[PDB]
Amino acid sequence: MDPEGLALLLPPATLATLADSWLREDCPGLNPVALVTGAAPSQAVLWAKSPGILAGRPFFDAIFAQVNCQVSWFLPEGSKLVPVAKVAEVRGPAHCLLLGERVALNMLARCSGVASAAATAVETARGTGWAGHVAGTRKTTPGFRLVEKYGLLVGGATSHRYDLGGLVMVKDNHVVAAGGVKQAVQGARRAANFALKVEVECSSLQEALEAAEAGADLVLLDNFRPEELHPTAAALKAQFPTVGVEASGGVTLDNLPQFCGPHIDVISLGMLTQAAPALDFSLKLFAE
Template identity: 75%
Template structure:
């Protein structure tokens, strides 16, 4: 699905609830910094400083909408990021813009990291001629599941199975017990398909980008990787204030 269309599936109420909870956690009481920054109108440029896939615009928007700021995007959802690139501009009262800054950046960085990992896994699978479904797992961060599941979709992966009865999962423990990963995995999958042609077979457990090709086979329907959410590094974004009418200048990321 077109990444831009994925945002239409997100409930506005759910987005608003998430944004409110994140902001309340980050600033549960008084905000003394607001006395210093004031309420004058301000502009800030959003910069991507690491490569990957842009994902999480709806969550970024929801945070800033909650603090009365407006976001103008310069790149579409799912766009490849080549640093240093300006991704968006944010406008609003200075104290509100700075109140939402860290929360919005955290959500965007995490979602983009998951999308980037998912896109890399899909690329490996397709590069090995495997047409099946690359998926995440239930190994998500509590309270952040919607963000991470959405990131998987933007990156081209599937969120995961929802009905255990509709899918047989061959995990690493089955492989160890059998003594041979490649032979037993694909032999078991072939036997299942022969007896139950409509049953989906999922391979899961200890799968990484390096060993993913070993799990690609004609009888495997889904390969799920917990590392897409558990181990995906967050992308590096920054939000920099600039004077209205001037052109923001990007700063290269330090090694």
Template identity: 65%
Template sequence: YYWPGMTKDIVEWVGRCVTCQKGRKDVPLHPAVESKMDTLVEIKMDAPVEIKMETPVESKKTPAPPGQSRLPASPSHTPAPSTPGSVSSSRSLSSCPLLPDSTERRWQADGMTSRLDLSHLLPPPRLRQLVRDWLQEDAPAFDPAGYTVGDCPERAVLLCKSPGVLAGCPFFDAVFTELGCTVEWFQPEGAWLEPVARVAEVRGKARHLLLGERTALNCLGRCSGVATATGRACRLARQASWHGQVAGTRKTTPGFRLAEKYALLVGGASGHRYDLGSLVMLKDNHVWAAGGIAQAVQEAQRVAGFHLKLEVECRSLEEALEAAEAGSDIVMLDNFSPEDLHPAASALKAAHPRVMVEASGGISEENISQFFGPCIDVLSLGCLTQSARAVDFSLKICRETSVQRDFAF
């Protein structure tokens, strides 16, 4: 189905909602489709079909505010064109990664949270502060190489050269927005990318493109690597029909925690605590220094208030039971083998059904399936941020010559 003026962002909804509506009258149409029902034209999908779909004008774009992602994944993410008018782009429906017949290529099909606009979680002032610190680290004084290229306007294409989940788009946006450049995304955050994929296009002054290049690529590659590793772990949990949550840890790169925690969310996991003040976690050193679990819990409750949950790291079932008795909301069974973990968790739940049980330590993608169990509520993995391999991206300035086009695309 197609109507004049239809954008590529809504093709997916048309393919799904109208098809369902034909077979089941109780399935509601998406509002974007329902408003166009009287102008829909049926087209046959037996063969690839080329249609003209309107997209925003590529020139004279206004930079999005830091933290606002240009996600084309759904109608709610569609950015309004910064200037009136549009240009037509031709795309084969049979190869469109957002169509129902290509669902196996979409990472979101496995239940990842990237269908939501997670960029709205990021406070713009904090995002601006981060990218300014990153850029200042790379260029604290002169930029002689930037001097050689000057302020001539250029266009650069972002390419993905290794497979993975796209994550970190708001940080990439913020880097170039800080430098007065504009970014147009061709893939939604959370999409699975296969090399060589044309992911985005950046326009701006040559020296500004090159000044932000490495910082933006480092951030995007790191975030995408974390999201890719996280997505694999979450997929294993879903395949095992496990009811709990996969989570990250506080083992993050100094100065880069916000980006890595964001990538965990894009990958489908919980970010766990973001800092020392968002959850009271008493680790073994706290317990030893305080003189015992009961003493540590009592002192923590005195200052934590009603709004902060309390978690205690335990090395044995006896410690876990003591922590639950003392009033801990969450008990972490740390460095338990799978053989010891499940009996201990079962005994703890039997004695304290309302206590949340977390397992951590020694869990990886290779052995995570051994830790899934009915009495385990959370599995936290430090390897998601410590061992994730970055996705390889490159940014190539692309002038309108056949040689450059062939090289870039």
């Protein structure tokens, strides 16, 4: 829920190991430009130049700790950012500060870009009175899923499935390989047991009812026009009152209100991670 508690989701060793791979990527050997500046103790401020939502403090602190620098934060995680906000101050030896700089901003810029999109979508969804959840997807940048999912949460969206072991997601392709919806859910059931849930994407109302009848827990009504979506949803809820319904496909920040209806429990958008632009931050040294 509240953005500041979300940092408890991240084990410190995980953050350090991650900050380490990123820095290795950016400077795998020697850092020549360190000779340009030397190591005098220095101070920089992180400035937010785009509007949105601050997300990524834990990764950010971790990166800078890998180059022996410390960060002091003026804004809490999940704060609205308004240009040109003095977000934080970073201190350490000049060469170490500037080595951490690029990696830290790249991370923060994207973590916050996702969180901003998430929050814009969630706020819009709220506007309609809808009580449902706005969710992300598995359309994340390979290697960088931890950061992107955390961004989503900071923006107030639900992670949805983190990985291929969190809930048994039966998609289009799986149905076809299985030879029909009933057949797919049947193997999904054996795979899920009591621990995991089963979600099946459906193209029609028959499929959605066949799904729920087989023992699906959630129904993903995929790529419906909203005109055809909500009656199908009401219908499914009418024959199956407990079954969660999700709506996905061709959803955008602009068209999202249309997708918000009383029989829809979840709306997921790929654009939260696929088309969320990075926020602009800078880090500038200052004297004192």
